[PDB]
């Protein structure tokens, strides 16, 4: 640690010091009596910001929870989260791209270099409130959002013995001692499995029949062809389902 | 078209808005579908959630299988070697260490899978709710089924999880106005049966609250209450009587 | 505390959180719920309140004919809330419990570093400076197994507690988006009474 | 450090789990508060009906 002199009044029968959780926190020099602190000098995980390598190769190392004096080495910039080497500070304020902590977001902007800066929250706007002012829309617009919720997952299942003790008498025996440590595992896993199919059942099988839409698609003008299944398809998925099944690998 | 008129009327926009802008909304909905198709076909990072689920599971499986090649303190990780190198009086010890290790690895894997499964089940119950409340009906839980007032939805499957296309509704073009909570026509106030009062400067109008449409003030969209001394901000006006043209002729 | 148990800082600093809640306030106050669907449209407050009445089947003439009374009621309510918060320290039970659970877990974790787990000591350097490697291997092995098991248990506890907190946070996001940004009708979702 | 090099990914998977926790925290706060796109501000005159 950093042996700094203390003002802890060690009563003359006292030898060491300690803290809440049994950490040496003052000592007595055995040659010449005096009481001094102890504090272990800073550590903290390095973190490497980076824009996509498919765009550049400039990194921005961020040391965590360190003062910008022990960092051994440019354009050092001290922030609330640690010492941030590699980004020139900025007065502007843009949205967040690569977060850091306590309001520091990095980016790759303009001959270019990583910049760090205090993030923004949106263009400040003022509502012209007044006790006789109302503002009523005249023209609407329809949108279409997109929400993607997982439902099931890989219904795995593991044979305890083959994994742990694949094909050996002695290993099956030495596993016969630990009792029910196999059976309870597979029990939990098949619980997971069966409830997966329960998940799918609940999500999709809300309908009791199978409906089919007539051939004449005179839907007031709207055009569903991208979402309604196509007969000429090999498996009767629609178009957008088809785009979807390819994105995921 | 009649289902759509109902789904408007469900968010306080009298259907005449719809049946009078059918082609326009048709084109808006189609174009929206198109932009969605392009967005899905262009940005591979639209499917982040499902991709993350799959990757988490694959990572878990891979570390689980990699565990098999670790000593955990044994003289080897190839079970058969210990089984083909040591007499049972010591193979017992070695294989015991290996079994303890691999068993602990299995156990942690199972626990992780349990917690992740509970997470997925939470998302699945949320999905079931969204399906039953927006696909099969029409929601009013604001910002449950897409930013904006809500119209409908369309499920579209995807590998291990569903995807919605929330057809919401959003007003666009706005107009300052001069509102007033009442109208004192004969000393007795006149509040609106529905929607705000407005005026453009010289004539007072009542209108809806989400699509500016003026209506001259007859005594059928306004209901009386008391007299015009207790209201604050009540403003004088005339409130026409529709029955006069019938009686005068 | 200093055995490698770092604590990263939140991304949104408290002042940012404050600006956010102020934004929500000013929207809710001047504009109503419209700032949840589209662009915020100003509308005088008393008219917003009359709409929020008419939402629970009370024709607005009630409101505009009791404006002063309701105003004083709301103010007095605010005052009682201020006093209740400033007097009873046990109003913040849930939050204090979260913090205490986390600190308790951490303290258990750090205390574990002083237990033998069957070793001949807990001061790693002693066995590292007392035993020749052929047996320090055994001792340090036991210590490693123990401490590692303790750490795993800590991580698992954190995981489940985090799932708990996320459940609460999703409930919070719902309550925000359905009662702040609008007006709920799920009876007894947003406080006893018509909302 | 050596004798811990033997237990495989018992180090990496932990920090991975905890990092998941942390990033999830920041997503939590994002969902709760960042419901509004702009940053509004109330006018100087507070004539709020009383």
């Amino acid at each position: 640690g950093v042996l700094t002199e203390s003002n802890k009044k060690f009563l003359p029968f006292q030898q060491f010091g300690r803290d809440i959780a049994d950490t040496t926190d003052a000592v007595r020099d055995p040659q010449t009596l005096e009481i001094l602190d102890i504090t272990p000098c800073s550590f903290g995980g390095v973190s490497v910001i980076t824009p996509g390598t498919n765009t550049s190769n400039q990194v921005a190392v961020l040391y965590q929870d360190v003062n910008c004096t022990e960092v051994p080495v440019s354009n050092v910039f001290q922030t609330r989260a640690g010492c941030l080497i590699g980004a020139e500070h900025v007065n502007n304020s843009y949205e967040c791209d690569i977060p850091i902590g306590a309001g520091i977001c990095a980016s790759y902007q303009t001959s270019q270099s990583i910049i760090a800066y205090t993030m923004s929250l949106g263009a400040e706007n003022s509502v012209a409130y007044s006790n006789n002012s109302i503002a009523i829309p005249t023209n609407f617009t329809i949108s279409v959002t997109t929400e993607i919720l997982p439902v099931s997952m890989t219904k795995t299942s593991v044979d305890c013995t083959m994994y742990i003790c694949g094909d050996s008498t002695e290993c099956s025996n030495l596993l016969l001692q630990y009792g029910s440590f196999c059976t309870q595992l597979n029990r939990a896993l098949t619980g997971i499995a069966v409830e997966q199919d329960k998940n799918t059942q609940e999500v999709f099988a809300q309908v009791k029949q199978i409906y089919k839409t007539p051939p004449i698609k005179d839907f007031g003008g709207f055009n569903f062809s991208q979402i309604l299944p196509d007969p000429s398809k090999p498996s009767k998925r629609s178009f957008i389902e088809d785009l979807l099944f390819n994105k995921v690998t | 078209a009649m289902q759509m008129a109902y789904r408007f009327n469900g968010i306080g926009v009298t259907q005449n808005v719809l049946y009078e802008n059918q082609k326009l909304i048709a084109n808006q909905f189609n174009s929206a579908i198109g932009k969605i198709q392009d967005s899905l076909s262009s940005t591979a990072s639209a499917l982040g959630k499902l991709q993350d689920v799959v990757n988490q599971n694959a990572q878990a499986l891979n570390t689980l299988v990699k565990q098999l090649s670790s000593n955990f303190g044994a003289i080897s990780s190839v079970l058969n070697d210990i089984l083909s190198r040591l007499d049972p009086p010591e193979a017992e010890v070695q294989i015991d260490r290996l079994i303890t290790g691999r068993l602990q690895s299995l156990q942690t894997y199972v626990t992780q899978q349990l917690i992740r499964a509970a997470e997925i089940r939470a998302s699945a119950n949320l999905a079931a709710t969204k399906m039953s409340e927006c696909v099969l009906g029409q929601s009013k839980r604001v910002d449950f089924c897409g930013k904006g007032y809500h119209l409908m939805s369309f499920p579209q499957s995807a590998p291990h999880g569903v995807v919605f296309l929330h057809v919401t509704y959003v007003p666009a073009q706005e107009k300052n106005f001069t509102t007033a909570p009442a109208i004192c026509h004969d000393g007795k106030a006149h509040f609106p049966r529905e929607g705000v009062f407005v005026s453009n400067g010289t004539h007072w109008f009542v209108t809806q609250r989400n699509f500016y449409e003026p209506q001259i003030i007859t005594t059928d969209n306004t209901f009386v209450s008391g007299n015009c001394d207790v209201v604050i901000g009540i403003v004088n006006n005339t409130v026409y009587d529709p029955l006069q043209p019938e009686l005068d002729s | 505390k200093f055995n490698g148990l770092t604590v990263l800082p939140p991304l949104l600093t408290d002042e940012m959180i404050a600006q956010y809640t102020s934004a929500l306030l000013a929207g809710t106050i001047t504009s109503g719920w419209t700032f949840g669907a589209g662009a915020a449209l100003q509308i005088p407050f008393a008219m917003q309140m009359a709409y929020r009445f008419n939402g629970i089947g009370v024709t607005q003439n009630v409101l505009y004919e009791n404006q002063k009374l309701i105003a004083n009621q709301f103010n007095s309510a605010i005052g009682k809330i201020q006093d209740s918060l400033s007097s009873t320290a046990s109003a913040l039970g849930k939050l204090q419990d979260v913090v205490n659970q986390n600190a308790q877990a951490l303290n258990t974790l750090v205390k574990q570093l002083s237990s033998n787990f069957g070793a001949i000591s807990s001061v790693l350097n002693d066995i590292l400076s007392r035993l020749d490697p052929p047996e320090a291997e055994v001792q340090i092995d036991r210590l490693i197994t123990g401490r590692l098991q303790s750490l795993q248990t800590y991580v698992t506890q954190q995981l489940i507690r985090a799932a708990e907190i996320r459940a609460s946070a999703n409930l919070a996001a719902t309550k925000m988006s359905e009662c702040v940004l609008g007006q709920s009708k799920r009876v007894d979702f947003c406080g006893k009474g018509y909302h």
Side-chain angles (χ1 to χ4, degrees), chain A residues 21 39-40 43-44 64-65 81 96 99-105 118-119 121 127-137, chain C residues 2-13 16 19-20 29-31 40-47 107 110-111 114:
Chain A
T39 311
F43 50 82
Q64 269 169 338
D65 300 20
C96 203
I100 281 175
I104 307 307
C105 292
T118 288
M119 55 179 289
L121 317 169
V127 192
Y129 179 111
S130 277
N131 52 11
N132 71 347
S133 165
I134 206 176
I136 287 171
Chain C
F2 285 74
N3 294 317
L5 311 96
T6 59
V7 171
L8 321 176
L11 177 61
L12 281 86
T13 174
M16 281 166 205
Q19 289 183 1
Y20 269 154
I29 282 161
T30 46
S31 42
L41 323 167
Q42 80 251 30
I43 174 165
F45 194 94
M47 301 198 46
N107 276 341
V110 56
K111 200 264 184 181
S114 173

Coordinates of all heavy atoms in Angstrom, one line a residue, chain A residues 21 39-40 43-44 64-65 81 96 99-105 118-119 121 127-137, chain C residues 2-13 16 19-20 29-31 40-47 107 110-111 114:
Chain A
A21 N -13.9 -4.8 8.0 CA -13.9 -6.2 7.5 C -12.5 -6.8 7.6 O -12.0 -7.5 6.7 CB -14.4 -6.3 6.1
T39 N -3.1 1.9 2.6 CA -4.1 1.9 1.6 C -3.5 1.3 0.3 O -2.5 1.8 -0.2 CB -4.7 3.3 1.4 OG1 -5.0 3.9 2.6 CG2 -5.9 3.3 0.5
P40 N -4.1 0.3 -0.2 CA -3.5 -0.4 -1.4 C -3.7 0.4 -2.6 O -4.8 0.9 -2.9 CB -4.2 -1.7 -1.5 CG -5.4 -1.6 -0.6 CD -5.5 -0.2 -0.1
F43 N -6.2 0.0 -8.5 CA -6.3 -0.9 -9.6 C -7.6 -0.6 -10.3 O -8.2 0.4 -10.0 CB -6.2 -2.4 -9.1 CG -7.1 -2.7 -8.0 CD1 -8.4 -2.9 -8.3 CD2 -6.7 -2.6 -6.7 CE1 -9.3 -3.2 -7.2 CE2 -7.5 -2.9 -5.7 CZ -8.8 -3.2 -5.9
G44 N -8.0 -1.5 -11.2 CA -9.2 -1.2 -11.9 C -9.0 -1.6 -13.4 O -8.0 -1.4 -14.0
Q64 N -10.1 2.4 -15.5 CA -11.2 2.6 -14.6 C -10.7 2.9 -13.2 O -9.9 2.2 -12.6 CB -12.0 1.3 -14.6 CG -13.1 1.3 -15.6 CD -13.8 -0.1 -15.7 OE1 -13.1 -1.1 -15.4 NE2 -15.0 -0.1 -16.2
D65 N -11.4 3.9 -12.6 CA -11.1 4.2 -11.2 C -9.7 4.4 -10.9 O -9.1 3.9 -9.9 CB -11.7 3.1 -10.3 CG -13.2 2.9 -10.5 OD1 -13.7 3.4 -11.6 OD2 -13.9 2.4 -9.6
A81 N -15.3 8.5 -14.2 CA -15.2 7.1 -14.2 C -13.8 6.6 -14.2 O -13.6 5.4 -13.8 CB -16.0 6.5 -15.4
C96 N -25.6 9.3 -27.4 CA -24.6 8.3 -26.9 C -24.4 7.3 -28.0 O -25.3 6.8 -28.6 CB -25.1 7.7 -25.6 SG -23.7 6.9 -24.7
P99 N -21.1 4.2 -24.5 CA -21.2 4.8 -23.2 C -20.0 4.5 -22.4 O -19.2 3.6 -22.6 CB -22.4 4.1 -22.5 CG -22.4 2.7 -23.2 CD -22.0 3.0 -24.6
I100 N -19.7 5.4 -21.4 CA -18.6 5.2 -20.5 C -19.0 5.2 -19.0 O -18.7 4.2 -18.3 CB -17.5 6.3 -20.7 CG1 -16.7 6.0 -22.0 CG2 -16.6 6.4 -19.6 CD1 -15.8 7.1 -22.3
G101 N -19.7 6.2 -18.6 CA -20.1 6.3 -17.2 C -20.1 7.7 -16.7 O -19.2 8.5 -17.0
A102 N -21.2 8.1 -16.0 CA -21.3 9.4 -15.4 C -21.4 10.5 -16.5 O -20.8 11.5 -16.4 CB -20.2 9.7 -14.4
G103 N -22.1 10.1 -17.6 CA -22.3 11.1 -18.7 C -21.3 11.3 -19.7 O -21.2 12.3 -20.3
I104 N -20.4 10.3 -19.9 CA -19.4 10.3 -20.9 C -19.7 9.3 -22.0 O -19.7 8.1 -21.8 CB -18.0 10.1 -20.3 CG1 -17.8 11.0 -19.1 CG2 -16.9 10.3 -21.3 CD1 -18.0 12.4 -19.4
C105 N -20.0 9.8 -23.2 CA -20.2 8.9 -24.4 C -19.2 9.3 -25.4 O -18.9 10.4 -25.7 CB -21.6 9.1 -24.9 SG -22.9 8.5 -23.7
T118 N -19.8 15.1 -23.0 CA -20.9 15.0 -22.1 C -22.2 14.8 -22.9 O -22.5 15.7 -23.7 CB -21.0 16.2 -21.2 OG1 -20.0 16.2 -20.2 CG2 -22.4 16.2 -20.5
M119 N -22.9 13.7 -22.7 CA -24.0 13.3 -23.6 C -25.2 14.3 -23.5 O -25.3 15.1 -22.5 CB -24.5 11.9 -23.3 CG -24.9 11.7 -21.9 SD -25.5 10.0 -21.6 CE -27.0 10.1 -22.5
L121 N -29.6 14.9 -24.1 CA -30.8 14.2 -23.9 C -31.9 14.5 -24.9 O -33.0 14.0 -24.8 CB -31.4 14.5 -22.5 CG -30.3 14.5 -21.4 CD1 -30.8 15.1 -20.1 CD2 -29.8 13.1 -21.1
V127 N -42.8 24.3 -24.4 CA -44.2 24.3 -24.7 C -44.8 25.7 -24.4 O -44.7 26.1 -23.2 CB -45.0 23.2 -24.0 CG1 -46.3 23.1 -24.6 CG2 -44.2 21.9 -24.1
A128 N -45.4 26.4 -25.3 CA -45.8 27.7 -25.1 C -47.2 27.7 -24.4 O -48.2 28.2 -24.8 CB -46.0 28.5 -26.4
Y129 N -47.2 27.1 -23.2 CA -48.4 27.1 -22.3 C -49.0 28.5 -22.2 O -48.2 29.5 -22.1 CB -48.0 26.5 -20.9 CG -49.2 26.5 -20.0 CD1 -49.7 25.3 -19.6 CD2 -49.8 27.6 -19.4 CE1 -50.8 25.2 -18.7 CE2 -50.8 27.5 -18.6 CZ -51.3 26.3 -18.2 OH -52.4 26.3 -17.4
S130 N -50.3 28.5 -22.2 CA -51.0 29.8 -21.8 C -52.4 29.4 -21.5 O -53.0 28.6 -22.2 CB -50.9 30.8 -23.0 OG -49.7 31.5 -22.9
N131 N -53.0 30.1 -20.5 CA -54.3 29.6 -20.0 C -55.4 29.7 -21.0 O -56.5 29.4 -20.7 CB -54.6 30.4 -18.8 CG -54.5 31.9 -19.0 OD1 -54.4 32.3 -20.1 ND2 -54.6 32.6 -17.9
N132 N -55.1 30.2 -22.2 CA -56.1 30.1 -23.3 C -55.4 29.7 -24.6 O -55.7 30.3 -25.7 CB -56.9 31.4 -23.4 CG -56.0 32.5 -23.9 OD1 -54.8 32.4 -24.0 ND2 -56.7 33.6 -24.3
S133 N -54.6 28.7 -24.6 CA -53.9 28.3 -25.8 C -54.0 26.8 -26.0 O -53.5 26.1 -25.2 CB -52.4 28.7 -25.9 OG -51.7 28.0 -26.9
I134 N -54.7 26.4 -27.0 CA -54.8 25.0 -27.4 C -54.3 24.8 -28.8 O -54.4 25.7 -29.6 CB -56.2 24.4 -27.2 CG1 -56.1 22.9 -26.9 CG2 -57.0 24.6 -28.4 CD1 -57.4 22.3 -26.6
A135 N -53.7 23.6 -29.0 CA -53.0 23.3 -30.3 C -53.5 21.9 -30.7 O -53.1 20.9 -30.2 CB -51.5 23.3 -30.1
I136 N -54.4 21.9 -31.7 CA -55.1 20.7 -32.2 C -54.5 20.3 -33.5 O -54.4 21.1 -34.4 CB -56.6 21.0 -32.3 CG1 -57.2 21.1 -30.9 CG2 -57.2 19.8 -32.9 CD1 -58.6 21.6 -31.0
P137 N -54.2 19.0 -33.7 CA -53.7 18.5 -35.0 C -54.7 18.6 -36.0 O -55.9 18.4 -35.8 CB -53.2 17.1 -34.7 CG -53.9 16.7 -33.4 CD -54.0 18.0 -32.6
Chain C
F2 N -11.8 -3.2 -1.2 CA -10.6 -3.0 -2.0 C -9.9 -4.3 -2.3 O -8.7 -4.3 -2.5 CB -9.6 -2.1 -1.2 CG -10.1 -0.6 -1.2 CD1 -11.1 -0.2 -0.5 CD2 -9.4 0.3 -2.0 CE1 -11.5 1.1 -0.5 CE2 -9.8 1.6 -2.1 CZ -10.8 2.0 -1.3
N3 N -10.6 -5.5 -2.3 CA -10.1 -6.7 -2.7 C -10.5 -7.1 -4.1 O -10.7 -8.2 -4.5 CB -10.6 -7.8 -1.8 CG -10.0 -7.7 -0.4 OD1 -8.8 -7.4 -0.2 ND2 -10.9 -7.9 0.6
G4 N -10.6 -6.0 -4.9 CA -11.1 -6.2 -6.3 C -12.5 -6.1 -6.5 O -13.0 -6.3 -7.6
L5 N -13.3 -5.6 -5.5 CA -14.7 -5.5 -5.6 C -15.1 -4.2 -6.1 O -15.7 -3.4 -5.3 CB -15.4 -5.9 -4.3 CG -14.9 -7.2 -3.6 CD1 -13.8 -6.8 -2.6 CD2 -16.0 -7.9 -3.0
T6 N -14.8 -3.9 -7.3 CA -15.0 -2.6 -7.9 C -16.5 -2.3 -7.9 O -17.4 -3.1 -7.6 CB -14.5 -2.5 -9.3 OG1 -15.1 -3.5 -10.1 CG2 -13.0 -2.7 -9.3
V7 N -16.9 -1.0 -8.1 CA -18.2 -0.6 -8.3 C -18.3 0.4 -9.4 O -17.8 1.6 -9.2 CB -18.8 0.1 -7.0 CG1 -20.1 0.7 -7.3 CG2 -18.9 -1.0 -5.9
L8 N -18.8 0.1 -10.5 CA -18.9 1.0 -11.6 C -20.0 2.1 -11.3 O -20.9 1.8 -10.5 CB -19.2 0.3 -12.9 CG -18.4 -1.0 -13.0 CD1 -18.8 -1.8 -14.2 CD2 -16.9 -0.8 -12.9
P9 N -19.9 3.2 -11.9 CA -20.9 4.3 -11.7 C -22.0 4.1 -12.7 O -21.8 3.6 -13.8 CB -20.1 5.5 -11.9 CG -19.1 5.2 -12.9 CD -18.8 3.7 -12.7
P10 N -23.2 4.6 -12.3 CA -24.3 4.5 -13.2 C -24.1 5.3 -14.5 O -23.3 6.3 -14.5 CB -25.5 5.1 -12.4 CG -24.8 6.1 -11.6 CD -23.5 5.5 -11.2
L11 N -24.7 5.0 -15.6 CA -24.5 5.7 -16.8 C -25.2 7.1 -16.7 O -24.5 8.1 -16.9 CB -25.0 4.9 -18.0 CG -24.8 5.8 -19.2 CD1 -23.4 6.1 -19.4 CD2 -25.4 5.1 -20.5
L12 N -26.4 7.1 -16.4 CA -27.1 8.4 -16.2 C -26.8 8.9 -14.8 O -27.2 8.2 -13.8 CB -28.6 8.2 -16.4 CG -29.1 8.2 -17.9 CD1 -29.1 6.7 -18.3 CD2 -30.6 8.6 -18.0
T13 N -26.1 10.0 -14.7 CA -25.8 10.6 -13.4 C -27.1 11.2 -12.9 O -28.0 11.6 -13.6 CB -24.7 11.6 -13.6 OG1 -24.6 12.3 -12.3 CG2 -25.1 12.7 -14.6
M16 N -28.8 14.0 -14.5 CA -29.6 13.7 -15.7 C -30.9 13.1 -15.4 O -31.9 13.5 -16.0 CB -28.8 12.7 -16.6 CG -27.7 13.3 -17.4 SD -26.5 12.2 -18.0 CE -25.1 13.2 -18.2
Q19 N -33.2 15.9 -14.7 CA -33.7 16.6 -15.9 C -34.8 15.8 -16.5 O -35.8 16.3 -17.1 CB -32.6 16.9 -16.9 CG -31.7 18.0 -16.4 CD -30.6 18.3 -17.4 OE1 -30.6 17.8 -18.5 NE2 -29.7 19.3 -17.1
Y20 N -34.6 14.5 -16.6 CA -35.7 13.6 -17.1 C -37.0 13.7 -16.4 O -38.0 14.0 -17.0 CB -35.2 12.2 -17.2 CG -34.5 11.8 -18.4 CD1 -33.6 10.8 -18.5 CD2 -34.8 12.5 -19.6 CE1 -33.0 10.5 -19.7 CE2 -34.2 12.2 -20.8 CZ -33.3 11.2 -20.8 OH -32.7 10.9 -22.0
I29 N -47.8 18.5 -17.3 CA -48.4 19.7 -16.7 C -49.0 20.6 -17.8 O -50.1 21.0 -17.7 CB -47.4 20.4 -15.9 CG1 -47.3 19.7 -14.5 CG2 -47.9 21.8 -15.7 CD1 -46.0 20.0 -13.8
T30 N -48.2 20.9 -18.8 CA -48.7 21.8 -19.9 C -49.5 21.0 -20.9 O -50.5 21.6 -21.4 CB -47.5 22.4 -20.6 OG1 -46.5 21.4 -20.8 CG2 -46.9 23.4 -19.7
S31 N -49.1 19.8 -21.3 CA -49.6 19.2 -22.5 C -50.5 18.1 -22.3 O -51.4 17.9 -23.1 CB -48.4 18.6 -23.3 OG -47.5 18.1 -22.4
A40 N -46.0 17.1 -28.2 CA -46.7 17.7 -27.1 C -47.5 18.9 -27.6 O -46.9 19.8 -28.2 CB -45.8 18.1 -26.0
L41 N -48.8 18.9 -27.3 CA -49.7 20.0 -27.7 C -50.0 20.7 -26.4 O -50.6 20.1 -25.4 CB -50.9 19.6 -28.4 CG -50.6 18.4 -29.4 CD1 -51.9 17.8 -29.9 CD2 -49.9 19.0 -30.5
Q42 N -49.8 22.0 -26.3 CA -50.1 22.7 -25.1 C -51.7 22.7 -24.9 O -52.4 22.6 -25.8 CB -49.7 24.2 -25.1 CG -50.5 25.1 -25.9 CD -49.8 25.5 -27.2 OE1 -49.0 24.8 -27.7 NE2 -50.1 26.7 -27.6
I43 N -52.1 22.8 -23.6 CA -53.5 22.9 -23.3 C -53.6 23.4 -21.8 O -52.9 22.8 -21.0 CB -54.2 21.6 -23.5 CG1 -55.6 21.6 -23.0 CG2 -53.4 20.5 -22.8 CD1 -56.5 20.5 -23.5
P44 N -54.4 24.4 -21.5 CA -54.4 24.9 -20.2 C -54.7 23.8 -19.2 O -55.3 22.8 -19.5 CB -55.5 25.9 -20.2 CG -56.3 25.5 -21.4 CD -55.4 25.0 -22.4
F45 N -54.2 24.0 -17.9 CA -54.2 22.9 -17.0 C -55.7 22.5 -16.6 O -56.1 21.4 -16.8 CB -53.5 23.2 -15.8 CG -53.2 22.0 -14.9 CD1 -52.1 21.3 -15.1 CD2 -54.1 21.6 -14.1 CE1 -51.8 20.2 -14.3 CE2 -53.9 20.5 -13.3 CZ -52.7 19.8 -13.4
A46 N -56.5 23.5 -16.2 CA -57.8 23.2 -15.8 C -58.6 22.4 -16.8 O -59.4 21.5 -16.5 CB -58.6 24.5 -15.4
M47 N -58.3 22.6 -18.1 CA -58.9 21.8 -19.1 C -58.4 20.4 -19.2 O -59.1 19.4 -19.3 CB -58.8 22.5 -20.5 CG -59.3 23.9 -20.5 SD -59.6 24.4 -22.2 CE -60.4 22.9 -22.8
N107 N -20.7 -7.8 2.2 CA -20.0 -7.9 3.4 C -19.7 -9.4 3.7 O -18.6 -9.8 4.1 CB -20.7 -7.2 4.6 CG -20.3 -5.8 4.6 OD1 -19.3 -5.3 4.1 ND2 -21.2 -5.0 5.3
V110 N -16.9 -10.4 1.4 CA -15.5 -10.0 1.8 C -15.1 -10.7 3.1 O -13.9 -11.0 3.3 CB -15.5 -8.5 1.9 CG1 -16.5 -8.0 2.8 CG2 -14.1 -8.0 2.3
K111 N -16.0 -11.0 3.9 CA -15.7 -11.7 5.2 C -15.2 -13.1 4.9 O -14.3 -13.6 5.6 CB -16.9 -11.7 6.1 CG -16.5 -11.9 7.6 CD -16.6 -13.4 7.9 CE -16.3 -13.6 9.4 NZ -16.4 -15.1 9.8
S114 N -11.5 -14.5 5.1 CA -10.8 -14.8 6.4 C -11.0 -16.2 6.9 O -10.7 -16.4 8.1 CB -11.1 -13.7 7.4 OG -10.5 -14.1 8.6

